[PDB]
Write a protein that binds this ligand. Structure first.
Ligand code: DMA
Ligand code: DMA
Ligand SMILES: [Cl-]
Ligand SMILES: [Cl-]
Lengths: 331, 331
């Protein structure tokens, strides 16, 4: 029994109850199914589990962190609803997305509703004005990270802004700034908010934040590796320079090899043979191994921050699962 | 010089400054133009003017209400950004909409940003946790009102939810519930929030709320009359049962006339001759005059609530302008 299965057994029912409770406030009966849909499609709930484990580590209690746990999971799902609209995603967690089942525009009315459910949860935390400010900052970080990820694409969008503001160059630093915002900030928030729910120790809150950030970066990097070396080459087909292996490669490839890889990424339809050729360019500079070493760097940073947090056994198990440690080292 | 021109001269520059200030917090330079766009396209700013006039009426000061004034105008514009996406609107205030100039999906990233700018303004008010709760309630009221308005349509959408959840019947009561939410609540909030910014008198806050609600309903009704009798018959072309004249008519028309009017509204493309025929049905039961009498009812209610508020001269001028009193009585 993994730490996730165990924490789902301990915290799960209460997490699901809290999500429904905040979303249900003021919710019209004939809109209920549409609004509850995104939280009824499953998910690992890793973020709220992290929130509750962090609270429990520092204080021995997890229940006072339930409102914070619902905030972080509701923000996750709010971002997913709009992500599916923007990317026109049809499937998630093996089921139709909100935009697919209900329509793009119905999905927007749902997303708008989620942000106010998040606000109800904020008002239900131990420190409402502090949570309110951190929620605004984290949502803006996610929005900015998403903006950057799209502008780091090499092709494939029909929004004049995404086309015209597309960045000319994407460095490894750029890539790290982007994933810290898009993926890291909300995982940093999950940990930090668990601590804030049960403790006024600022040092512990800051350690939990730094721990979640680093873990989220390590996770995204690994995810990016899978999304290249497996459906082989999914991020190449999708024109992404905001991919760790690609960004690593672009930093090492010679001028002609560099120009070629960008040419492939910018192809309106990327063929199988384009993928293979792109992967060969990546391998020609050992980009995959370098990406995985970068993931190790952040995983080790997460561990140093985590060492500052008391009673951290369960959080250490979650970290290993989150950064898919066992798997990554096997690769 | 009308009350609006006068209040724009007094409050305007400070209102515009506050909008830019909250939106600018944490705003990336290359996203600035896209995000500031919706507030740089003009607008009467009637809502924040009402906020500031209400504060000034009860306390003699308007500046402490600037954060509340920015909240209400930012909510207005947040709702407009998504309204333009959902309705695929190309033009607003004589210029391209955000979705038009930047793209539907860029518009979403902008809308997401507006809600967090609204939250920064909330944190800057005299009573942050109270404002935070009222903002969540009012945004949910707008979202629900919008949901109802779309489900009150007789045709014309491609979202499975809008088609499948479309209401079978739309009564006058239904119509009033809908406009109270879609239009009234935020105008009620504008007034009430001005009072809350400078006073703990609950009776005055409640009077300002009731005053703004009633004014917003009267305004929407009149707007609906214009949107029938003038571009003649715009709401008929757009399949709206959520129109005061239409809703009045449906309540009085005989079975065959009633069935016919609905048939016209449900026509996938409504022709000129369908409009004229629809208008004749409306006139056959004096629906326009009845709608305007309903607008008078709410305008008179607004006045009774307004009478409970001290030093109310300017607020009375705004009310007349808001419910286009002079014009309505001329019609
Ligand atoms: C933090 C982490 C490793 C999450 C993995 O799943 P997900 O959050 O991307 O998706 P879901 O919400 O479906 O579990
Ligand atoms: C409250 C009221 C009578 C508003 C009229 O203008 P609007 O708010 O619909 O549009 P804009 O924001 O462009 O002035
Ligand atoms: Cl507990
Ligand atoms: Cl003042």
């Amino acid at each position: 029994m993994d730490v996730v299965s165990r924490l789902h057994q301990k915290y799960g029912a209460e997490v699901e109850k809290a999500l429904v409770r905040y979303l249900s406030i003021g919710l019209a009966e004939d809109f209920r199914e549409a609004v509850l849909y995104q939280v009824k499609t499953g998910g690992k709930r890793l973020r709220p589990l992290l929130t509750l484990a962090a609270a429990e580590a520092v204080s021995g209690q997890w229940r006072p962190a339930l409102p914070a746990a619902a905030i972080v999971e509701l923000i996750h799902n709010y971002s997913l609803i709009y992500d599916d609209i923007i990317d026109r995603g049809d499937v998630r967690r093996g089921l139709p997305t909100v935009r697919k089942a209900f329509g793009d525009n119905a999905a927007i009315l749902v997303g708008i509703w989620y942000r106010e459910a998040i606000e109800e949860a904020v008002l239900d935390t131990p420190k409402p004005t502090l949570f309110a400010k951190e929620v605004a900052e984290v949502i803006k970080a996610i929005d900015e990270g998403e903006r950057l990820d799209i502008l780091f694409e090499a092709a494939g969008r029909s929004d004049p802004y995404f086309v015209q503001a597309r960045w000319r160059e994407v460095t490894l630093d750029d890539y790290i700034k982007m994933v810290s915002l898009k993926t890291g900030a909300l995982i940093a928030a999950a940990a930090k908010w668990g601590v804030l729910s049960v403790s006024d120790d600022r040092g512990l809150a800051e350690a939990a934040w730094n721990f979640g950030m680093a873990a989220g970066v390590a996770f995204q990097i690994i995810d990016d590796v899978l999304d290249i070396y497996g459906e082989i080459g999914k991020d190449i087909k999708e024109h992404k320079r905001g991919n760790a292996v690609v960004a690593v490669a672009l930093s090492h490839l010679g001028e002609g090899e560099r120009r070629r890889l960008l040419e492939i990424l910018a192809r309106e339809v990327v063929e199988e043979a384009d993928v293979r050729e792109a992967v060969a360019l990546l391998d020609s500079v050992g980009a995959r191994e370098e990406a995985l070493r970068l993931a190790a760097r952040y995983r080790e940073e997460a561990e140093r921050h985590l060492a500052k947090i008391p009673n951290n056994g369960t959080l250490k198990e979650l970290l290993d699962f989150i950064v898919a440690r066992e798997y990554a080292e096997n690769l």
